[PDB]
Amino acid sequence: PQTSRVLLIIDDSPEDRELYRRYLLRDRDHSYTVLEAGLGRRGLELWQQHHPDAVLLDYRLPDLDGLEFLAKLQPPPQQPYLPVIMITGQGNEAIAVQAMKAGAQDYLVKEQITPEELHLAVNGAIETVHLRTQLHQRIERERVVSQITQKIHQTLDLEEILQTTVTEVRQFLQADRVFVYRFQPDFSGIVVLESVGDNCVPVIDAQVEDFVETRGEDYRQGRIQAVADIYTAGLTECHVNLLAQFHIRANLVVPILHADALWGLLVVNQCSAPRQWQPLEIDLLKELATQLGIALQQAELYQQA
Amino acid sequence: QTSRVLLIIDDSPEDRELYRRYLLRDRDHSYTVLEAGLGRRGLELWQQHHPDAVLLDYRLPDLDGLEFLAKLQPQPYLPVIMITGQGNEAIAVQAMKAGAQDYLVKEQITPEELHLAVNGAIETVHLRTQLHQRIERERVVSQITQKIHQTLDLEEILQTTVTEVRQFLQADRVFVYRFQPDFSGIVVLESVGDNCVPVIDAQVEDQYFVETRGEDYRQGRIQAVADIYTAGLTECHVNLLAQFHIRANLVVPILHADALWGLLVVNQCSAPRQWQPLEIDLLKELATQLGIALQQAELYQQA
Ligand SMILES: *[C@H](C)[C@H]1/C(=C/c2[nH]c(/C=C3N=C(/C=C4/NC(=O)C(CC)=C4C)C(C)=C\3CCC(=O)O)c(CCC(=O)O)c2C)NC(=O)[C@@H]1C
Ligand SMILES: *[C@H](C)[C@H]1/C(=C/c2[nH]c(/C=C3N=C(/C=C4/NC(=O)C(CC)=C4C)C(C)=C\3CCC(=O)O)c(CCC(=O)O)c2C)NC(=O)[C@@H]1C
Ligand SMILES: [Mg+2]
Ligand SMILES: [Mg+2]
Ligand SMILES: [Mg+2]
Ligand SMILES: [Mg+2]
């Protein structure tokens, strides 16, 4: 009975919209909340305002046809693919084939739709967009990693490597802030590099003194700190106050090891809201940190020569 | 127009012929169509021909669609489209849960629906396969990266690389060819199954690179040859490779500083093999990582 999917139906026949709603009720696996529009314009507003999990789109509407509609649909950057199923007229398959090249996941012929066919198409559209998104992110993640490896092979300057790392990581994660924290001999730390958008307070020029001496045992042993919400993570009053002071709400911290030594931290922040850090994100940061370590070893070995 | 192999499993010869006609109407693709009238024969043809898609009748004399699916032991995904009777949709839903990509209602089949379903099945299996490959590929690269971070031992790094790339590619042989100062070559490491004649300790000395100095490889040339016999190589080159049962060959240069240090080579020895962009890019990235390990070992030596 709990809503498990939201579907937007855009179709100028109210009776057909009601038919598809009923058909969806037959699905034992999901509970659908259905948004309804009779015009392309209202359908676009509902898509933008309410983010449905899938769309059933009539190939012909009073104000737009399906192709014009698809063209105006902007996906979220979180999922740059459109969970759209085109419903086309009998004998009009060719138009629907064009709709798939333009981003639709599937199509149905209006007259031949059964409850089962509908559940199938909707299931498929949602699953396929999820699959396309996963593949998309792997390609991006491999690009970022491969780029750092190339810079190291080319023996480029450490500063450029850190800068590329912080920028590309922030862009990939869509994070509010990413920075590199370097430990000095006296076990003090300074922020060396920062990439920050509009959501956080810049920290590069506003840092005082601060813990590595006393509890970097975990960082030295390569462990990461993943905090979804600073208020529910059980930190000390001081630590929470410090992070809140810079509007940090979620915190992901990965150590940078040079040989066996704790050189610094690669840190990611969300400042706008809590954020659950995901396995693929954590693995990427860990791999980048390892690469930074390799770059550090290169620079030191190069220095001694 | 790309070629596809499709397997039809249906005990009605007239239905098989209808779907064959329907497929030929597709102007985008060229179909080689295999046919079976029994599930048991359909299973053996699937095993022998690895078709791009399968049309599977929900009711066969020896097996039903679900039993057939259960017996398909391929981490691949199955490009199977189930064909079910009207009113038997419940069976088709079960098939979707059991690995089928799509289903069609026999009475309702049009040429267009058939093309849509076949395309979707193939495209979807392709997505899942690529995702799988990207995940495996990242593991190999990450492992090498960890090894470089943890050690200067060039041999262990080279060894891990050869073993993992071979395993990932399911290739018959992978080896590392290192150049001597005079650009003569030696095989330093080899990973080989049973399909090829081992080339370490079975040395063929070659001087071809003393002459040219691998300059084409030094500026990054990669060689990706699917079939040594049809690639337009010289009679001699072919003969040397034929001697070691090499059938397909993939060669990626290893660069140390700006110098051609050696070659990372992969061979297929049982059959021709088209090397894929993802595979070629993985080998380049690894060759680049080897370069980093080489550079590190050199800067270390100097201290
Ligand atoms: C409270 C008594 C004191 C204190 C405690 C404290 N600090 C940390 C961890 C970090 N402190 C960071 C300091 C900086 N400096 C910056 O410029 C900056 C942001 C711009 C920060 C966040 C710092 C980078 C860390 C890293 C880990 C993190 O959570 O961000 C901790 C946590 C230790 C642990 O391992 O849990 C504590 C308890 N800091 C003080 O200044 C106090 C005197
Ligand atoms: C014909 C005149 C002779 C000849 C030609 C030849 N060889 C190459 C390239 C390679 N030769 C390789 C030699 C080795 N040694 C091995 O132990 C071994 C496999 C186990 C081989 C393959 C060698 C590694 C290469 C690298 C490129 C490759 O194809 O593997 C070439 C040119 C290749 C190109 O693309 O230019 C030629 C013309 N080798 C002989 O022994 C002949 C006398
Ligand atoms: Mg209409
Ligand atoms: Mg369908
Ligand atoms: Mg039958
Ligand atoms: Mg599909």
| Whole-number Å distance between alpha carbons of A35 and A50 | 9
Look at ligand 1, atom 20, and give the residue with the nearest C-alpha. Answer: A203
Q: What is the CATH number of the domain that holds A91?
A: 3.40.50.2300
Beta carbons of A135 and B130 less than 8 Å apart = yes
Please answer whether residues B24 and B72 qualify as being in contact, where contact means their C-beta atoms are separated by less than 8 angstroms: no
Q: Which positions 10-69 of B are in contact with A (Cβ < 8 Å)? A: none
Indicate the length of chain B as a whole number: 303
Disruptive mutation site among A28, A114, A122, A135 for chain B (greatest number of B CBs within 10 Å): A135
Count Cβ neighbours within 10 Å for each residue of B40-61 and write b for 16 or more, e otherwise: eebbebbeeeebbbbbbbbbbe
Q: Which domain holds residue A23?
A: 6-133
**Closest-lying ligand 1 atom to the alpha carbon of residue A236:** 38
Amino acid occupying residue A221: Q
Through-space distance between the first and last CA atoms of chain B, rounded to whole angstroms: 60
Chain B positions in Cβ-Cβ contact with residue A124 (cut-off 8 Å): 102, 120
The residue ranges of DSSP E strands in B193-273, in sequence order, are 223-225, 248-256, 259-268
CB atoms within 10 A of CB B244: 16
CB atoms within 10 A of CB B300: 13
Please answer whether residues A192 and A184 qualify as being in contact, where contact means their C-beta atoms are separated by less than 8 angstroms: no
Please answer whether residues A294 and B149 qualify as being in contact, where contact means their C-beta atoms are separated by less than 8 angstroms: yes
Beta carbons of B116 and A134 less than 8 Å apart = no
Please answer whether residues B138 and A141 qualify as being in contact, where contact means their C-beta atoms are separated by less than 8 angstroms: yes
How many angstroms separate the CA of residue A117 from the nearest CA in chain B?
A: 9
Q: Resolution of this PDB entry, in A?
A: 2.0
Please answer whether residues A19 and A115 qualify as being in contact, where contact means their C-beta atoms are separated by less than 8 angstroms: no
Residues 6+ positions from A211 with CB-CB distance below 8 Å: none
| Whole-number Å distance between alpha carbons of B262 and B179 | 5
| DSSP state letter for B37 | S
Backbone angles phi, psi at B64, to 5 degrees: -100, 170
The residue ranges of DSSP E strands in B37-172, in sequence order, are 53-57, 80-84, 102-105
Q: B33 has which bridge partners?
A: B6
Q: Which residue has the tokens 């676009």?
A: A44
| Whole-number Å distance between alpha carbons of B174 and B179 | 17
Closest to B272 (Cα-Cα) out of B223, B225, B224, B226: B226
Q: How far is CA B26 from the centre of its chain?
A: 27
Please answer whether residues A20 and A9 qualify as being in contact, where contact means their C-beta atoms are separated by less than 8 angstroms: yes
> Which of A124, A139, A149 has its CB closest to that of B285?
A149
Closest to B95 (Cα-Cα) out of B128, B75, B117, B113: B117
| Whole-number Å distance between alpha carbons of A240 and B246 | 63
Q: How far is CA A284 from the centre of its chain?
A: 13
Classify burial at A74, counting beta carbons within 10 Å of its beta carbon; exposed 0-12, middle 13-18, buried 19 or more. exposed
Question: How many CA atoms are closer than 13 Å to the CA of A32, on its beta-carbon side?
Answer: 27
